[PDB]
Amino acid sequence: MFHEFRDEISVLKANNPHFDKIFEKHNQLDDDIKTAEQQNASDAEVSHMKKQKLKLKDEIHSMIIEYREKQKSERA
Template sequence: MFHEYRDEISALKAKNAHFEKIFEEHNELDKKVTNAENGLNPLSDIELDKLKKQKLKLKDEVYAMIMEYRKNSH
């Protein structure tokens, strides 16, 4: 996720515990979604949809924090 912001992500993870927490939570949700979609951990459509929405919410929050960091560091 956001490979083009690798430097910003590393800096934020080192400086901001909340960022690190939501970044890792997003990655965990991504694994759960991928496993469900590949049949490794079957979920109902409702459960899968809920996970995807949570993942997207976290992704939006991570992106906003990256953009704020970039704005303030330049």
């Protein structure tokens, strides 16, 4: 919810060269969970897809962790 969670996560993670793979794979999950949530072909299917969301999110969120430690270690 913090500014650095949407501004640091969307600016550094949504614009970093790694976003290509980290965001494409992550954006795919959110695309598979939403496409599955549209009709909910199967609760277990829609609930299993989300499990990959927070998982594929950890990589996007984890990037910031390494970004705040590199920017503070490299810049600070």
